[PDB]
Design a protein around this ligand. Structure first.
Ligand SMILES: Cc1cc2nc3c(=O)[nH]c(=O)nc-3n(C[C@H](O)[C@H](O)[C@H](O)COP(=O)(O)OP(=O)(O)OC[C@H]3O[C@@H](n4cnc5c(N)ncnc54)[C@H](O)[C@@H]3O)c2cc1C
Length: 241
């Protein structure tokens, strides 16, 4: 019975944990563009993740450690040691804990849900203002580290198709939002859909009524109202600690 209108810090910190210990850990060696993508994304986290003091200090420490590695190749084992030295387990957690991303069954929702939330939050933080590097950094992360390539593939299809049209932080926020809805549409009512959390064109009317237009002559979404709702929804004040 989580509040669909809130953001739970637990989902965000679990996402970070999963990213650093699981997704990045799938590669014995981090090099080339994958390493560049990791550094750009961590730089984005260090600056835009809405973390508590200990977590923000942790991200800055990891960010700086990465910036110092002059080498072109970084063994994951070496990165794991850096995480351990910076007590990520104490700062974040040992096991994931989903609240707003809790699937009705283990295989439903979870990390993928937390990743979307994290991504949207990063775009909004950048718009309540490097900033221009948020969406590319997110694209970079999805391409080089995101587990389910099925999930990834569909995201990259959208990026090349239009991510290049994004010319501002606000546009980037809306781009990710609408791109997420295009994914929602294809997944709606699918055999893989969590029955307890049906896919819909988000935000639904009960969440944001002004975001929705009435005429079949005017667009479905009120882009201005939607932008404001997004800035309000993905904000530090809307996070439950
Ligand atoms: C880049 C990317 C590509 C993916 N591609 C696929 C794929 O091709 N196939 C497949 O099976 N799975 C894919 N997934 C997974 C999928 O999108 C879901 O994350 C998953 O099915 C869990 O769905 P969910 O219902 O819990 O909510 P999610 O879609 O994970 O949503 C997280 C939450 O964010 C909010 N939200 C919903 N829509 C929006 C929106 N438009 N804008 C802002 N916030 C929103 C809601 O509060 C919701 O509970 C992908 C994930 C990512 C991050």
């Amino acid at each position: 019975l989580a509040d669909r209108s809130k953001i739970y810090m637990a989902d965000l910190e679990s996402a970070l944990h999963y990213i650093l210990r699981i997704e990045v850990g799938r590669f014995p060696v981090l090099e080339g563009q994958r390493l560049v993508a990791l550094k750009k994304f961590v730089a984005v986290l260090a600056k835009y993740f809405p973390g508590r003091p200990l977590v923000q200090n942790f991200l800055h420490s990891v960010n700086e450690w990465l910036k110092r590695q002059k080498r072109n190749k970084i063994p994951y084992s070496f990165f794991k040691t850096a995480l351990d030295d910076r007590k990520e387990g104490a700062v974040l957690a040992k096991k994931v804990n989903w609240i707003g991303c809790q699937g009705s069954e283990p295989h439903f929702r979870g990390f993928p849900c937390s990743l979307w939330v994290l991504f949207h939050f990063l775009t909004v933080q950048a718009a309540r203002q490097k900033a221009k590097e948020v969406l590319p950094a997110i694209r970079g992360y999805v391409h080089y580290f995101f587990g389910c390539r099925d999930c990834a593939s569909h995201f990259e299809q959208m990026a090349a198709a239009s991510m290049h049209r994004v010319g501002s932080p606000n546009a980037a926020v809306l781009w990710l939002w609408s791109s997420h809805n295009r994914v929602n549409a294809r997944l709606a009512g699918a055999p893989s859909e969590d029955p307890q959390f049906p896919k819909v064109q988000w935000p639904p009317r009960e969440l944001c009524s002004a975001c929705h237009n009435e005429r079949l002559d005017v667009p479905v979404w009120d882009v201005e109202a939607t932008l404001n709702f997004l800035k309000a929804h993905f904000s530090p004040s809307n996070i439950i600690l």
